[PDB]
Amino acid sequence: ANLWERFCNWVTSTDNRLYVGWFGVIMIPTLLAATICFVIAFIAAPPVDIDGIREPVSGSLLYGNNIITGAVVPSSNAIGLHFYPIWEAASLDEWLYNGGPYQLIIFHFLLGASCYMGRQWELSYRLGMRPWICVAYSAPLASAFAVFLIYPIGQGSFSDGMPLGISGTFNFMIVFQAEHNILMHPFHQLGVAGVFGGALFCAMHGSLVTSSLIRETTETESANYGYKFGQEEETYNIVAAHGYFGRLIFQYASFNNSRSLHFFLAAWPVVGVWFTALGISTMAFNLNGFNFNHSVIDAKGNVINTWADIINRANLGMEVMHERNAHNFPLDLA
Amino acid sequence: LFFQGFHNWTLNPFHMMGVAGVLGGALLCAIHGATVENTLFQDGEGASTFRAFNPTQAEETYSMVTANRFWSQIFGIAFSNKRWLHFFMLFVPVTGLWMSAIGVVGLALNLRSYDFISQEIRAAEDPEFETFYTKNLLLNEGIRAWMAPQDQPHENFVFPEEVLPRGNAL
Amino acid sequence: MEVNQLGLIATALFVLVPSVFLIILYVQTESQQ
């Protein structure tokens, strides 16, 4: 009944429509701050000298951008990895030219998103659940860390973190392929496998359960009203589903245990996305995709091109054009 | 890479709907597998929860009630209907692939979403006007001229060095 | 920006027509109960 104990009980209460928790105490302010800065910047920020060459790039709607082209531009290469809060600028005008909003947004989002993961652990503890939904979320959270933090650390500059917009995203992934040959990296290939695999298994599982709904309805009503929230009996027939999928392929390639099947659904996209987040994180230290440029030559020693060498011709066209005014010396070492 | 340099396929809203369906599927796949695995009933004594399922049991093996409360409070909304849930897992990735099929059909014909006209008019008239939209087309322009002769041998493209688009130093 | 003028009526109808259809069917659903 002491004033602190009562606060602690509200924070951790299972009765708030939205759970707060000790993690929620950091998350709420930092996400509200990143959110509000982002919304304002996207709409109204003036142009930003991302590449530190006094060539500002317009990112917001009021400066002639649409939903597809707008972005909060990353902070100036001139800043590199230096901290740049508002209070280090001589004025908001300076802070805006050099791209301060981006730093503010990413740090607060990374924090609140970290606490988001932990908040998932927390409520699971308070509800008597098993604990690992948060392990699943760490795959996307790790992805956000790689492109907003890890990649800039290893290249030495936040100007090279992922822009916060739709075309900026594509710009980031084009330059990435030119500099890292990421398609030829096995961890991106496992990401594609994680991600294609995930869509496949989602559709499979969704179609197998849907295929074996037990008749509880008429033709004139949704099959969905055959399930009632909290009913104890399962709402589909799992052995009829296993019966069909075993024969579509062969018996032993089909689950008859729903716990293994659902664990499989969780493991496949999580693991693959860990790897492809690791791929971005290790390419941050420039351990790049396989390089077979000129790996095939004839008896005389002519180059005999493969598809790798074609890939490289396109990587070259990305290379020579990106950040066209920003390089004074022949190699783009960062 | 061909479709990026020649079609600017990433800018096509039918591909974007494909992306949201594939990644949405993968999301749904992970999140539904992890929810079930962490809302399980305790039906066996041992620490491997797999043993405690029986394929023939009528009783559900995880709690839809504790799953629904969890996600309502973490995320604000949650599923309440198991049939809609699993039908939605069918719907999301199936539809996204269908939308991207349509887009590629457009590209059969070079009917690309390659440009935004308003942007080009301004940038032509205003050399201080730069966006990520204009930067990406420079890259597309790099790809086309550098890969085309080797990639389309039958066109006998000959591009002497002076005509190749290149930024400074590189 | 020099932008397609019918863009506005196109976007406004693209939203209003399907949205209104859904509202009509929701509200006559509540009145049944």
Partner: peptide
Amino acid sequence: METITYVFIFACIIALFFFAIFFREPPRIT
């Protein structure tokens, strides 16, 4: 007018969020 349109649609989405969460049909057991 493009800007006004973009931001009006965005703002409608945020309001839908509000009603989707706090004014949801409340799930009822069995």
